[PDB]
Amino acid sequence: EGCCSNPACRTNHPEVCD
């Protein structure tokens, strides 16, 4: 996926990766 690594794109919206 595309935001599940950089912890800051993840924590913004995480359901689009985890």
Residue 18 Cα to chain centre, angstroms: 7
Number of Cβ within a 10 Å radius of residue 5: 9
* Those residues with Cβ within 8 angstroms of residue 12's Cβ, 6 or more apart along the chain or in another chain: 3
Residue that the structure tokens 């919206």 belong to: 13
Using only C-alpha atoms, the chain has a radius of gyration, in whole angstroms, of 6
Tokens at 18, concatenated: 């985890």
DSSP label at residue 6: S
d(CA 4, CA 15): 10
Residue that the structure tokens 């689009």 belong to: 16
Distances in Å between the Cα of 6 and the Cα atoms of 1, 12, 16, 17 are 11, 11, 13, 11
